[PDB]
Amino acid sequence: GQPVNDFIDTATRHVLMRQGVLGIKVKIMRDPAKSRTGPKALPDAVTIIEPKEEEPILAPSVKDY
Amino acid sequence: XXXXXXXXXXXXXXXXXXXXVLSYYKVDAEGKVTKLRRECSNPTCGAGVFLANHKDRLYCGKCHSVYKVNA
RNA sequence: ACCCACUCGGCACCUUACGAGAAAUCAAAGUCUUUGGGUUCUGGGGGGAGUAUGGUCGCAAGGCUGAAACUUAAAGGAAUUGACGGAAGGGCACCACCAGGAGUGGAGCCUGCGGCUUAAUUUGACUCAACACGGGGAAACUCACCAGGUCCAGACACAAUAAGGAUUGACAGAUUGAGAGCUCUUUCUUGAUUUUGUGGGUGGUGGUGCAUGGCCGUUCUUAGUUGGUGGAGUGAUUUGUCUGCUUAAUUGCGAUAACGAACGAGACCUUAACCUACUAAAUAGUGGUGCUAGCAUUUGCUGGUUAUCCACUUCUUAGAGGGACUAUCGGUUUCAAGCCGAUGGAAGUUUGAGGCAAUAACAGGUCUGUGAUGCCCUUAGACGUUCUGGGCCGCACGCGCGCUACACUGACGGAGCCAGCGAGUCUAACCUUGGCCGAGAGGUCUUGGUAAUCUUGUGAAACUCCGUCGUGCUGGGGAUAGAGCAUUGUAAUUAUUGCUCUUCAACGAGGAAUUCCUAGUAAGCGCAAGUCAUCAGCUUGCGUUGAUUACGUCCCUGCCCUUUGUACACACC
Ligand SMILES: [Mg+2]
Numbered sequence: 001g002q003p004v005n006d007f008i009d010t011a012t013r014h015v016l017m018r019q020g021v022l023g024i025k026v027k028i029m030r031d032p033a034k035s036r037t038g039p040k041a042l043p044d045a046v047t048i049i050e051p052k053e054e055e056p057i058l059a060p061s062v063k064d065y
Numbered sequence: 066x067x068x069x070x071x072x073x074x075x076x077x078x079x080x081x082x083x084x085x086v087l088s089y090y091k092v093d094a095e096g097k098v099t100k101l102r103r104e105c106s107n108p109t110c111g112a113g114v115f116l117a118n119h120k121d122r123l124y125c126g127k128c129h130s131v132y133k134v135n136a
Numbered sequence: 137a138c139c140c141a142c143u144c145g146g147c148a149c150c151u152u153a154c155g156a157g158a159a160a161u162c163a164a165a166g167u168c169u170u171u172g173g174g175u176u177c178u179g180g181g182g183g184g185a186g187u188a189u190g191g192u193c194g195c196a197a198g199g200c201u202g203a204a205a206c207u208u209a210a211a212g213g214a215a216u217u218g219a220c221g222g223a224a225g226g227g228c229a230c231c232a233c234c235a236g237g238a239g240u241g242g243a244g245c246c247u248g249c250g251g252c253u254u255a256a257u258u259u260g261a262c263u264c265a266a267c268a269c270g271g272g273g274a275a276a277c278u279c280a281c282c283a284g285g286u287c288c289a290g291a292c293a294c295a296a297u298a299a300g301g302a303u304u305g306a307c308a309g310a311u312u313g314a315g316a317g318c319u320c321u322u323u324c325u326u327g328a329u330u331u332u333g334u335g336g337g338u339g340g341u342g343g344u345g346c347a348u349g350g351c352c353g354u355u356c357u358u359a360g361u362u363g364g365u366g367g368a369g370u371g372a373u374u375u376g377u378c379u380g381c382u383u384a385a386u387u388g389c390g391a392u393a394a395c396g397a398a399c400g401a402g403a404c405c406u407u408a409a410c411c412u413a414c415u416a417a418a419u420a421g422u423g424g425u426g427c428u429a430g431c432a433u434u435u436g437c438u439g440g441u442u443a444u445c446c447a448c449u450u451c452u453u454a455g456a457g458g459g460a461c462u463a464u465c466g467g468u469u470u471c472a473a474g475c476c477g478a479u480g481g482a483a484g485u486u487u488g489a490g491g492c493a494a495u496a497a498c499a500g501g502u503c504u505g506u507g508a509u510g511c512c513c514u515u516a517g518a519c520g521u522u523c524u525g526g527g528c529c530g531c532a533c534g535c536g537c538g539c540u541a542c543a544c545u546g547a548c549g550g551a552g553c554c555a556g557c558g559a560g561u562c563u564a565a566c567c568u569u570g571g572c573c574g575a576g577a578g579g580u581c582u583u584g585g586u587a588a589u590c591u592u593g594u595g596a597a598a599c600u601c602c603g604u605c606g607u608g609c610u611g612g613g614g615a616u617a618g619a620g621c622a623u624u625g626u627a628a629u630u631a632u633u634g635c636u637c638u639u640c641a642a643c644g645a646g647g648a649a650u651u652c653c654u655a656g657u658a659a660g661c662g663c664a665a666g667u668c669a670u671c672a673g674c675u676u677g678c679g680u681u682g683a684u685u686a687c688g689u690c691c692c693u694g695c696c697c698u699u700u701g702u703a704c705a706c707a708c709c
Pocket residue numbers: 001
């Protein structure tokens with residue numbers, strides 16, 4: 001998919017030797033968190049903000065200013 | 066593949082012949098020098114270059130061929 | 137006779153496993169390096185071989201006893217994971233079938249393949265996954281093939297020749313297909329650039345795709361791959377990754393010695409759909425106004441006018457947003473994931489259609505895309521290259537993709553008259569409107585456009601309407617062939633293509649077989665783009681007209697999955 005275009009660089013290189021040639025194929029996948037100028041995460045990613053304990057009750061009452 | 070055939074007769078090349086040449090020019094009894102063979106009135110060939118003597122034919126070789134002066 | 141409880145001794149099964157084992161398994165195969173109850177028998181790597189020999193028993197066939205030389209690095213056991221089967225159980229699918237549509241297979245031609253022919257008819261590829269494929273529509277070119285002619289573009293190093301010239305070129309004639317100084321005659325020219333030799337290079341559409349890279353096709357219209365902590369196992373391993381249900385999906389639910397995750401699917405992206413909401417526009421358009429034509433006249437109706445001005449953004453354009461989440465309701469289901477129906481909705485089949493796409497495999501195709509490349513070959517009488525000419529088109533015939541037909545839901549003739557995706561000329565001749573001339577093809581003079589501006593509303597074709605014909609190989613059909621005219625091109629003969637007249641074949645719905653397909657789909661229909669000087673019966677996309685039939689299954693076929701066997705693991709080639 002699309003994240004491929006966004007996050008992985010590839011290169012093929014032909015390395016000519018005494019016997020024949022070999023194909024080097026390099027693939028690098030870069031930290032998307034660091035994206036900088038694009039999307040900062042995979043389309044996959046789904047973060048939930050973590051609530052907060054509450055200490056409720058305290059029967060009514062009102063503040064004045 | 067197939068290899069070879071030939072109803073024969075291979076073609077050769079050329080030679081530039083021999084000739085200890087430019088004897089042509091003649092100097093009299095000490096020491097006046099007269100040119101044999103006439104030279105070229107083309108601006109390109111400042112009259113050092115001569116004309117070969119055939120028949121009808123006098124011809125400038127320096128002009129790689131160029132021009133047909135006839136006397 | 138039957139039931140309950142007990143007990144000796146039987147044939148066995150069940151569950152455990154403290155314990156054993158290399159494991160499979162075992163109440164003995166336990167009580168074994170913590171090694172001793174009694175006793176008998178047999179084995180000491182594989183083959184050679186239960187062979188030779190002697191003894192013995194037998195009527196015999198044979199039985200008992202039973203060697204060595206020599207050979208050899210394994211043979212063997214159990215389990216694991218693969219692979220594979222002409223074993224069994226499940227699944228998936230219009231490259232399967234059901235219900236059907238439209239066909240192909242029969243005909244003419246077009247076009248590839250075989251075959252034959254040939255100087256040559258260059259060549260790759262042969263089930264799906266070779267044959268309108270190599271973007272492969274070849275007049276030269278391309279081009280590799282064939283008949284023949286030039287050239288070196290043979291780096292560099294060393295040696296040799298050699299300034300008394302190493303070498304170069306050529307006018308005319310001869311030659312030659314040729315206005316190739318190819319060679320020859322002849323005799324000027326050139327000046328250390330070459331020549332000759334060895335060494336070494338270099339080019340090559342020469343060989344090897346069974347030496348390679350890369351790319352691609354196929355498995356795959358598939359759903360699979362792995363790791364953390366836990367559990368099992370001495371171990372390779374296994375569980376997780378599973379009976380079921382569910383999904384297009386190892387998609388999920390559920391079951392659960394597993395829990396929770398990652399690659400792949402999904403998400404993501406592109407395109408087609410919806411925005412009287414946003415921002416705008418003389419390269420898009422609408423309403424008003426002026427200038428103005430025609431018809432009615434009573435307002436009216438239908439046009440002209442890239443700026444005569446004013447306003448707008450519904451339609452067009454493209455930025456930003458919004459929108460759908462199978463929503464609401466109800467059926468059905470283990471009331472789970474889901475599936476179904478109804479309403480709403482631009483939209484509810486993964487929204488439709490694509491792009492991307494893991495792990496692994498193949499001696500799949502490509503050295504003829506590459507100045508990607510190993511090795512082999514070849515290298516001046518070239519397999520380098522170029523030039524002239526022919527050839528890939530050759531025709532008893534077999535095979536594939538196709539085009540056009542057999543007519544009356546039609547052909548012909550008037551007339552109506554509507555798309556979408558494209559593309560177009562700089563140091564050049566591309567897309568072409570308009571005016572004339574021409575029966576046509578075309579010609580000619582001008583013209584707009586490097587483009588939302590011009591071609592172009594690309595006035596496309598099927599289609600619609602009024603006529604002619606009237607079932608007759610007919611006016612269906614248009615093969616083959618003759619004559620003439622034009623276009624591209626240096627070149628049109630074996631006829632590039634276009635036009636006119638004429639000639640008027642087979643084909644009366646196509647045997648056995650066989651392809652493709654579920655909605656704006658199938659089928660019909662044209663167009664633009666690729667190729668392209670010229671040539672589309674091909675492809676790739678596009679819009680126009682627009683159905684019948686399923687919404688299912690495992691019968692055929694194909695494939696995945698379990699279970700199972702394996703002496704395979706280079707893995708049934
Ligand atoms: Mg995806």
